C-alpha cells in the first residue's frame, strides 16, 4: 500500500530526476525484453542453428 | 525507447554498406622505377606514394 506513496515522495519532487529516471528505466526495460524474446527464440527451435550442423568444417 | 529506435535506424542507414566493406583489403603488384624517381600505382581505392 504505502510503497506507492514512499516511491513518489522519493522520486517525484523535482523534474530533472524524473527525466533521468525515465531514460534509465527505458534502457533497462528495453534490455530485459530483448533478453526474454531471445530466450524464447532459442527455446522454440533447437537443432536448427548455424552451429548445430554436424559437418560445418569438413569440406576440405 | 521507440524514438531511440527510429533515430538510430535512420542514422545508421547512411553508413557504408556490405558491398563496400567487402572490398577493403588486398595485395597487388607494382613495377620497377629509377633511383630517386616514382611511378604511382593503384589499389582498392587509394594510390601509393
Amino acid at each position: 500500500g504505502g510503497i506507492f506513496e514512499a516511491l513518489y515522495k522519493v522520486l517525484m519532487r523535482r523534474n530533472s530526476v524524473y527525466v533521468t529516471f525515465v531514460i534509465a528505466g527505458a534502457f533497462v526495460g528495453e534490455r530485459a525484453v530483448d533478453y526474454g524474446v531471445h530466450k524464447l527464440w532459442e527455446h522454440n527451435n533447437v537443432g536448427k542453428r548455424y552451429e548445430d550442423i554436424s559437418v560445418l568444417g569438413q569440406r576440405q | 525507447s521507440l524514438v531511440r529506435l527510429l533515430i538510430l535506424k535512420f542514422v545508421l542507414s547512411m553508413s557504408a554498406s556490405k558491398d563496400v566493406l567487402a572490398l577493403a583489403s588486398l595485395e597487388v603488384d607494382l613495377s620497377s622505377i629509377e633511383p630517386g624517381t616514382t611511378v604511382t600505382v593503384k589499389w582498392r581505392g587509394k594510390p601509393v606514394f
Binding site: 523535482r14 530533472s16 530526476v17 527525466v19 533521468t20 531514460i23 534509465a24 527505458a26 534502457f27 | 531511440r4 533515430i7 538510430l8
Partner: peptide, 29 residues
C-alpha cells in the same frame, strides 16, 4: 536564491548526460 538554481542546473546536466549515454552506448569510453 543561487543555491537552488545551481543545484537544479547541475541535476539537469546530469539528465542531459544520461540521455546522451542512452542514445549512444559506447563501452570504449
Amino acid at each position: 536564491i543561487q543555491p537552488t538554481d545551481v543545484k537544479a542546473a547541475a541535476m539537469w546536466g546530469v539528465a542531459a548526460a544520461t540521455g546522451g549515454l542512452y542514445l549512444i552506448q559506447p563501452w570504449g569510453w
